[PDB]
Design a binder for this molecule. Structure first.
Ligand code: 1VU
Ligand code: 1VU
Ligand code: BTN
Ligand code: BTN
Lengths: 69, 25, 70, 396, 271, 135, 135, 135
């Protein structure tokens, strides 16, 4: 689908996008600290970002939506 | 950069041929 | 005198162009000029790694054949 | 110094350790080794193998013993340098023992390194070259060293007849160090700087009262002329390396491979029409009188290519000559009677020498040519009592 | 096989600019990911790599390449997905790829950066044990040449799974940044130095400070290539730039292998 | 001859370091070599953890005891720390779990004697090796 | 060579000494001995305690001679310690080179059991036309 | 894969149903079943009668739909015809896929005879290092 969602429970260390921004496939959207690793979560398709719901320092759960692209 | 010199005898006539030293194919 | 020669089917080059052409062609030629005989080394050949049934005809046609081909 | 917690710092630390591996016990020991005119274990490997072809294994190893304060001293590599490389473009596994680390005595990690290279050689079907220089087992470690010796001997036996095994003796090999060389196919000792013996002269003096020097007891000349154990007595380390390379030039990488075969242009015609002057020299070689001997090397050279003959055990049982040559670029093992020694008669030592040589050639697919000028066996009660029957049947 | 030109010289002498980049590839912090395709492309010929199951179980990358014209099968951990942790899907994917390569005599190179198995109750309930043992079995039974390059982590059972020496890996080399240990320093110090970190709390000391100090000591002393290198589980600790010429040289050495195994009608791999 | 392994666990001895990992790898390699050659039966009569759980997965049969045996790669504490899930050892890797859910256990025994009886019954049907005939 | 090459069932019983290279020759474990047992009187060591002390403690012996102490008494005491600590079957048993230390009366039974267990063996060796035993 | 690979004796007894790919999986004759017997209640078909009719008689059912006939009765009539004609062991018996249609009481006798005769099957696969079973 069009939803970019967290792959695991983790801490949002960095947000690499802003609402309404256009991003390409493979572009970094957020950074999640999980299992002692700044794992990247990236866009799987080109498009405009809508519904950005991530704040730096927030602890979020697996399956939570990072954005819609 | 280097160049190689070879000698040919087409029909018995002597000729000096200069070719690139790194000639490929 | 029964060997294949190079043929210039069309065109009448002069000695200079002939020499240039032959030099370039000789330079292009290469590969194994006078290679030594390829050394036989059957160590760890794939045929030896196969499971053969105790009564398999491939024990003759594949295993023995491979080991004996010479 | 770069921070060890950075990637570049870790790389620099690795380079520091690698540099340390070159002189594990300090540069003074290397200076002493050179001052005696010897090469270090590393220099020996680098001189034998092709330039730049050496790949090392377990370079950073340290011993795990805690007996008798051994943990105070843990040289890198544990006193042996192991790896693989090429000789004349063909791969070989190699190990070299270092006499500056605990006198070259074998410990647990030492033996494990040797075992790793042995297993690699057997697995890949490549020749194994060992350079032996050591003072027996490392006494402080105990029976663990005996266990590792057993594993090494077992690997030698397992590889016997499977891959060519060549041992160089370039120092005092004492105690257990002597049994792997005995089990290997070829042995090359250096003239005056190498010895093999099981029991030292001190114990020999205590038990039997016999005064003997280390050179007399286990010198290269001793093991060539008396024991029949060494196959070559090199005049120097480079000479030993040259002989080893010549051996490998004739042998295949393993028993499933053919010996290297040079390309030689076969002339056309019959044997009569292809005779040479060097061949014609044989028509007049044999003396008119059967009582007059001749040197069989004359025939060997005249039948072999380029007159090049690599003799094996030259100084032992001279009444028989064995060695390697090439006929039309094809390696061959020569066994020949020598009329200039004991009238060419067969005896115990000649029989054993020729038998082992023939079995090596058969193991590694090298055909044999015999040159026969033999009147019988050497008469003597000593031969009979020492077992001319039992040990003459070995050649049969 | 393809014909290629082999540069003559030592592996140190034949380094290239592309090879030198591996020396800086690995980040300084152990938490930071990197893409393992960088290593794969820099060690394979012409940077050509045919991936298999690219869109499946991204935490492990499997595919085909050539090293000096010799086809090889790459199995590599991917730090950017799930920190490179092994899991059920990665285990099955890598296991079947290895078994195909072995059936058809294709040597395998394993690029290792793995912290462990992906924790979770779903993994256990779906059979991480049974279905992860498949990769262990496949690697164990492979009789082709098997080369291992350890970049960064190799912990615990993941270490045993990912081409350990005792599992038949012919040549194991490790980069200077490799971290081979039973478990992470945190859990280790939580267990060794136990009752001591508790005596500290009983006395009221800064338990957190003592833990962090003990973790630092453990990481400095043990979490590195060199304990394993000393035991011989690592054949060589190498500069990263040397990886391509070590893989090529090792495969050339191991082009012919004989391995003896007991006679069986067939194996009993877990299903 | 058949091989029977009774496992209790706790995983690798942490103090000893990577030598324990080397021995685990050797054990797994031997299991793989014996696979299909000789019968291999695993008894789980304790809490098998860490590397202790991989040899049983490679063996032919697995017999767990009902309430006194567990298998799990990672402990409930680590699971809690990483995923936030709260689970006991019994739920995570109990005999019932590995029978009903993960399909790893072949028998769940009411007691240790019952497990031994089932192992003897298994062996009654199997040959000593793949070159022998079943009794 | 003969012992290492042998593929038949090989059993070793040690009574008193097994020293140095003779240990390796006479049915050591790593040479392929299937079962090794040792009597309580077994003495498995690199070399006799006399030579072992004369080497391990040599610096103390010279130091004692320099200092005028009783070098002979010191040597005998060190030798006694070495014999009581290391000249016995238990270091080898610890390393696993000896499968069991047994009462001498158990020898016949152990040998019978071992032979019955080992009546069928499979040992893989590299292929070869034949060996190259020293002659 | 496992069934097709097995070279031990293989006997199949079909009691009621064997449909479609499940038929192929569960001991079909061409997958290597040494003996196949079917009870009188067996039912061997490509699929169930309902789906078979809904497919092979699409033409007539759609004509009935056009003309307003009672499709809900025509479908049941055709399904009954299909069940009475083809859902039985006899078509497979005709093709030779079933060795014999036996009374249920004969099952043990047939199985025992087959197993007694098939102790050592002289069968083989092409040589290979190993298979490539799906994982
Ligand atoms: C079981 C199989 C066996 O061989 S057990 C019996 C082993 N015993 C021996 O070989 C006797 C020891 N050998 C020696 O005395 C010499 O190393 C020999 C080989 C004779 C050569 O003499 P040389 O070159 O002068 O050496 P060195 O005597 O000065 O010794 C040099 C350093 O190495 C040491 N070393 C020697 N052998 C051993 C050994 N087996 N175990 C432990 N350490 C050994 C010496 O103590 C000496 O150490 P350091 O550097 O002087 O402190
Ligand atoms: C590759 C394998 C790995 O990576 S696992 C490495 C360690 N894994 C572990 O889970 C260790 C801790 N495990 C546990 O949670 C429990 O101790 C287990 C093993 C489940 C048993 O629980 P319980 O019955 O309460 O025992 P306990 O915790 O009181 O421990 C009893 C004694 O055993 C010890 N122990 C236990 N595990 C290890 C280990 N891995 N290495 C070393 N020692 C271990 C404990 O320290 C304790 O020793 P002591 O009797 O208190 O002196
Ligand atoms: C004169 O009678 C001398 C006889 C010598 C016999 C020779 S000696 C060497 C050979 N060995 C043997 O038994 N007869 C031969
Ligand atoms: C840190 O050591 C504790 C939490 C993270 C543990 C990581 S998660 C992924 C690896 N698998 C495992 O069991 N521990 C590692």
């Amino acid at each position: 689908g069009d939803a970019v969602t967290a792959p695991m429970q983790g801490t949002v260390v960095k947000v690499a996008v802003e609402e309404g921004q256009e991003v390409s496939a493979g572009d970094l959207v957020v950074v999640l600290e999980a299992m002692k690793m700044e794992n990247p979560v990236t866009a799987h398709k080109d498009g405009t970002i809508t519904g950005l719901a991530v704040e730096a320092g927030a602890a979020i759960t697996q399956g939570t939506v990072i954005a819609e692209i | 950069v280097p160049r190689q010199t070879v000698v040919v005898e087409v029909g018995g006539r002597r000729l000096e041929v200069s070719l690139p030293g790194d000639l490929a194919i | 005198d029964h060997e294949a020669h190079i043929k210039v089917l069309r065109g009448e080059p002069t000695p200079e162009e002939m020499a240039a052409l032959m030099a370039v062609l000789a330079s292009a030629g290469g590969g194994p000029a006078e290679p030594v005989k390829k050394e036989r080394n059957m160590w760890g050949h794939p045929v030896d790694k196969l499971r053969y049934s105790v009564f398999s005809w491939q024990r003759v046609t594949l295993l023995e054949r491979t080991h004996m081909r010479r | 110094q770069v921070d060890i917690h950075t990637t570049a710092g870790k790389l620099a630390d690795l380079k520091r350790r690698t540099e340390e591996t070159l002189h594990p016990v300090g540069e003074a020991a290397v200076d002493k080794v050179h001052a005696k005119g010897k090469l270090t274990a590393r220099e020996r490997i680098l001189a034998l193998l092709d330039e730049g072809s050496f790949v090392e294994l377990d370079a950073l190893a340290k011993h795990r013993s805690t007996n008798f304060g051994l943990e105070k001293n843990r040289p890198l590599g544990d006193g042996v340098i192991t790896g693989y490389g090429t000789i004349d473009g063909r791969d070989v596994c190699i190990f070299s023992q270092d006499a500056t680390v605990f006198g070259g005595s074998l410990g647990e990690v030492y033996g494990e390194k040797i075992v790793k290279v042995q297993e690699l050689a057997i697995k890949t079907g490549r020749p194994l070259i060992g350079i032996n220089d050591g003072a027996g087992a490392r006494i402080q470690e105990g029976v663990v060293s005996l266990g590792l010796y057993s594993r090494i001997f077992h690997n030698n036996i397992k590889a016997s007849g499977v891959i060519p095994q060549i041992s160089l003796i370039m120092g005092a090999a004492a105690g257990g160090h002597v049994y792997s060389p005995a089990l290997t196919d070829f042995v090359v000792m250096v003239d005056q700087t190498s010895q093999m013996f099981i029991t030292g002269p001190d114990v020999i003096k205590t038990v039997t009262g016999e005064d003997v020097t280390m050179e007399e007891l286990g010198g290269a000349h001793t093991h060539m002329a008396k024991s029949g154990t060494a196959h070559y007595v090199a005049s120097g380390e480079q000479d030993a390396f040259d002989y080893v390379r010549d051996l490998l030039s004739y042998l295949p990488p393993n028993n499933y491979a053919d010996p290297p075969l040079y390309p030689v242009a076969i002339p056309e015609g019959s044997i009569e029409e292809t005779l040479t002057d060097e061949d014609l020299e044989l028509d007049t070689l044999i003396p008119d009188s059967p009582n007059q001997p001749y040197d069989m090397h004359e025939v060997i050279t005249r039948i072999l290519d380029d007159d090049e003959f690599l003799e094996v055990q030259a100084g032992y049982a001279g009444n028989i000559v064995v060695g390697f040559g090439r006929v039309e670029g094809r390696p061959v093992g020569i066994v020949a009677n020598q009329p200039t020694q004991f009238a060419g008669c067969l005896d115990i030592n000649a029989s054993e020498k020729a038998a082992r040589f023939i079995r090596t050639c058969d193991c590694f697919n090298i055909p044999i040519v015999l040159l026969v000028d033999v009147p019988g066996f050497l008469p003597g009660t000593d031969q009979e009592y020492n077992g001319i029957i039992r040990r003459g049947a070995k050649l049969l | 096989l393809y014909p290629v030109a082999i540069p003559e010289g030592s592996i140190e002498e034949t380094l290239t600019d592309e090879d030198l980049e591996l020396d800086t590839l690995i980040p300084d912090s152990p938490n930071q990911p990197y893409d393992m395709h960088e290593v794969i492309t820099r060690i394979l010929d012409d940077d050509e790599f045919l991936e298999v199951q690219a869109g499946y179980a991204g935490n492990i990358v499997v595919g085909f390449g050539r090293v000096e014209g010799r086809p090889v099968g790459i199995v590599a951990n991917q730090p950017t997905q799930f920190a490179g942790c092994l899991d059920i899907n990665a285990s099955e994917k890598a296991a079947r790829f290895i078994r195909t390569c072995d059936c058809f005599n294709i040597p395998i190179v394993l690029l290792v950066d793995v912290p462990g198995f992906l924790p979770g109750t779903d993994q256990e309930y779906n059979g991480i044990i049974r279905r992860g043992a498949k990769l262990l079995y496949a690697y164990g039974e492979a009789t082709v040449a098997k080369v291992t390059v350890i970049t960064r982590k190799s912990y615990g059972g993941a270490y045993c799974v990912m081409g350990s020496k005792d599992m038949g890996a012919d040549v194991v080399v490790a980069w200077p940044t490799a971290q081979i240990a039973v478990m992470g320093a945190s859990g280790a110090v939580g267990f060794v130095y136990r009752q001591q970190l508790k005596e500290a709390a009983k006395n009221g000391e800064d338990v957190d400070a003592l833990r962090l100090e003990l973790q630092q000591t453990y990481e400095d002393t043990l979490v590195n290539p060199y304990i394993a290198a000393e035991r011989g589980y690592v054949d060589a600790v190498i500069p990263p730039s040397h990886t391509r010429g070590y893989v090529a040289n090792a495969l050339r050495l191991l082009e012919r292998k004989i391995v003896q195994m007991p006679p069986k009608k067939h194996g009993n791999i877990p299903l």
